[PDB]
């Protein structure tokens, strides 16, 4: 089409063919090899780099994160892919579930938590349950490095949960810890 940033996550599938988006395909590979490291996702990139990433993303160019002159600037990566989420014109969670996902997560036991939350997750629209399901699997192994990048579930979903799941960190670290039952 005309543009991945900014485009309705829907469209963008339709379009691309994709399972989930090239871009989120890219940069969880990219970071999954070669960013375990300390402060992944609460770093920042620098400006103008997460800029070019995204201009080259943006009209569909995969560039090669794995060699230089990307491979040193991991956090831009990272910002890059928090940003593709932040400017879906309807968030990842979508704007119809919302009010949904936070009731779920308000239930008083684990146990109805997961059976509201999975209620929620499996009305999600395909290309929403496509990514969300391979984001979340995503930040899961991500976790298990936390002794190294010092990001445990919570954090990593304190990060997220704001590009996310808008009209909240509690409902990320909810599905984020259930990862497996949930989309199994």
Request: net charge negative.
């Amino acid at each position: 089409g005309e543009r991945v940033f900014g485009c309705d996550l829907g469209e963008h599938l339709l379009n691309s063919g994709f399972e989930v988006p090239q871009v989120l395909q890219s940069c969880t590979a990219f970071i999954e090899r070669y960013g375990i490291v300390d402060g992944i996702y609460r770093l920042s990139g620098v400006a103008s780099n997460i800029q070019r990433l995204r201009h080259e993303f943006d009209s569909e160019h995969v560039p090669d994160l794995t060699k230089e002159p990307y491979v040193q600037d991991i956090h831009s990566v990272g910002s890059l892919c928090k940003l593709y989420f932040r400017e879906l014109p309807n968030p990842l969670l979508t704007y119809q579930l919302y009010e949904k996902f936070s009731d779920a997560v308000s239930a008083a036991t684990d146990e109805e938590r997961l059976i509201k939350i999975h209620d929620v997750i499996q009305q999600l629209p395909p290309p929403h349950y496509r990514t969300l399901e391979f984001l979340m699997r995503h930040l899961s192994l991500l976790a298990d490095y936390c002794s190294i990048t010092n990001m445990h579930a919570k954090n990593l979903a304190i990060v997220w949960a704001p590009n996310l799941l808008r009209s909240q960190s509690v409902v990320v670290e909810f599905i984020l810890n259930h990862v497996d039952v949930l989309f199994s």
